[PDB]
Structures are given as C-alpha cells and as structure tokens.
Amino acid sequence: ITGGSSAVAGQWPWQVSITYEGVHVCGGSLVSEQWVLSAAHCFPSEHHKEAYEVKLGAHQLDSYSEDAKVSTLKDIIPHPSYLQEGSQGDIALLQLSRPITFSRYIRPISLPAAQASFPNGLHCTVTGWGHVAPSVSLLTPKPLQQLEVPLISRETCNSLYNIDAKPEEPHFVQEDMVCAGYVEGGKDACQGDSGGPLSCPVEGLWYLTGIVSWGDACGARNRPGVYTLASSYASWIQSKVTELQPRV
Numbered sequence: 001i002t003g004g005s006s007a008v009a010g011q012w013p014w015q016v017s018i019t020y021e022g023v024h025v026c027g028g029s030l031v032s033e034q035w036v037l038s039a040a041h042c043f044p045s046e047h048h049k050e051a052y053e054v055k056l057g058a059h060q061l062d063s064y065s066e067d068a069k070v071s072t073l074k075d076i077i078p079h080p081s082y083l084q085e086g087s088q089g090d091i092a093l094l095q096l097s098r099p100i101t102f103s104r105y106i107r108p109i110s111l112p113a114a115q116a117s118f119p120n121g122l123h124c125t126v127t128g129w130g131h132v133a134p135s136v137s138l139l140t141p142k143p144l145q146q147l148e149v150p151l152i153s154r155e156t157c158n159s160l161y162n163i164d165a166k167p168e169e170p171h172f173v174q175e176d177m178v179c180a181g182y183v184e185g186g187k188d189a190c191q192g193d194s195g196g197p198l199s200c201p202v203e204g205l206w207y208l209t210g211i212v213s214w215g216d217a218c219g220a221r222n223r224p225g226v227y228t229l230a231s232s233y234a235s236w237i238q239s240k241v242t243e244l245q246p247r248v
C-alpha cells in the first residue's frame with residue numbers, strides 16, 4: 001500500500017497474508033472458517049499447492065503473535081474464466097487445510113450479493129503488506145497498511161487509463177471490475193497487495209466489495225488500482241462453497 005498508514009492489530013481481521021515458499025506474495029480475505037478469497041493470478045498453475053501458506057490474525061508479519069494462525073491449503077479454485085493477465089475472473093477461492101477458529105483477530109468479511117451496489121465515490125479501505133511504493137518493500141516488522149480510497153467507476157477508470165497510455169497495452173477495466181483511488185495518484189495498492197480486500201462501509205457494517213487485482217505503477221497519476229468485484233462472483237462463490245462444504 002502506498003500513501004496509506006499502519007493499521008492497528010485487529011482492525012481488519014479478515015485480511016490474510018498468502019505466502020509461497022515462505023515469502024509473502026499476495027493478500028486474501030477470510031470469508032468463513034475454512035475459505036479465503038484472493039485473486040486467481042496469485043496462483044499460477046506451475047506453482048505447487050503444498051508450498052502456499054495463509055497467515056491469519058497477523059498484524060506485523062515479521063513479529064511473533066500468539067493470535068496469528070498459519071495454515072496450508074486443501075484446495076485452490078480459480079474462476080474458470082480467468083485466462084491470462086488482465087482477464088475477467090481474477091478471483092480464487094482457497095480452502096484452508098483445516099478450519100480456523102474465529103477470534104478477536106480472525107474474522108470473516110461479509111460478501112455482497114450479486115446485485116450489491118457500491119456507489120461511485122464511496123470511501124472504502126484497501127489493506128495489505130505489499131510494497132509501499134513501486135519496487136519498495138514494506139519495512140520489517142511489516143505492520144499491515146491501510147488506505148482509504150474512493151470508488152471510481154470502471155468507465156471513468158477506463159478513461160483515466162487511456163491517458164498517455166502505451167498503445168500495446170490493453171489496460172481495460174472489465175465489467176467484473178471497479179477502480180478505487182485518486183486521479184492524481186500518490187495513494188494506491190501495490191505489488192504484494194493483490195488478492196487482498198477492498199472493504200467498503202455499508203449500513204454500519206463492512207463488505208468485501210473488491211479484490212485487489214491489477215494496475216500500473218502504484219500511485220501513478222491516472223492509474224487508480226483495479227479490483228475484481230466480489231458481487232460479480234457472489235453466485236459462483238455461494239454455489240461452490242455450498243456444494244463443497246455446506247454449513248451443517
């Protein structure tokens with residue numbers, strides 16, 4: 001996260017860290033006792049499922065905490081439509097090897113329904129342990145960063161991405177995506193944040209409006225972050241989890 005601030009422990013208790021061979025690579029969001037949502041691009045086919053872990057209940061990734069829990073994955077289910085970088089369907093369901101116990105520091109985030117509207121300009125928050133500027137890692141002990149960002153419609157976002165664009169790049173915000181950030185940049189999600197939550201306030205609650213997906217260099221002007229809309233996958237997520245692991 002660039003241009004944000006450190007959260008305090010427990011503030012975003014659905015935020016998880018996903019590591020591959022022990023290195024944090026992506027964020028995710030806890031959505032039940034055994035399932036996390038992240039981005040499909042975080043799980044390329046050539047990676048080995050047994051080399052992933054998910055750390056929940058963490059605030060400072062480098063610090064020991066008795067509240068944090070680390071799990072491996074039983075299943076990685078990318079959306080079938082995810083074809084390649086920039087594609088629709090950049091979302092994955094991850095089933096933890098074993099269920100966790102919710103606590104003060106580990107709690108799921110509510111998912112929106114298929115037609116949930118989050119209006120333009122709503123101030124949501126993106127969180128993560130990603131880079132704090134392009135090519136600059138968050139410094140140890142790596143406290144979770146948070147950043148308040150207004151939602152930017154995909155239409156506005158597509159117009160902004162066209163400004164001074166490289167013609168060979170599609171930079172196309174799809175129908176299943178929304179943006180959030182600032183036309184003048186400076187504040188955005190970066191590499192290492194992808195897969196993580198865009199948490200939006202609604203009626204006193206928080207919903208997972210988006211999953212951090214892609215963008216150009218974080219904090220560049222006219223290049224707000226692009227997020228996969230959870231509402232676009234509400235039906236699929238509910239069908240998949242209900243068939244695979246119904247709540248008894």
Ligand SMILES: N=C(N)Nc1ccc(CO)cc1
Pocket residue numbers: 130188189190191192193194195212213214215216217218219220223224225226
């Ligand atoms: N938000 C941007 N402008 N860039 C950006 C870079 C990487 C990821 C995934 O890690 C998300 C967004």
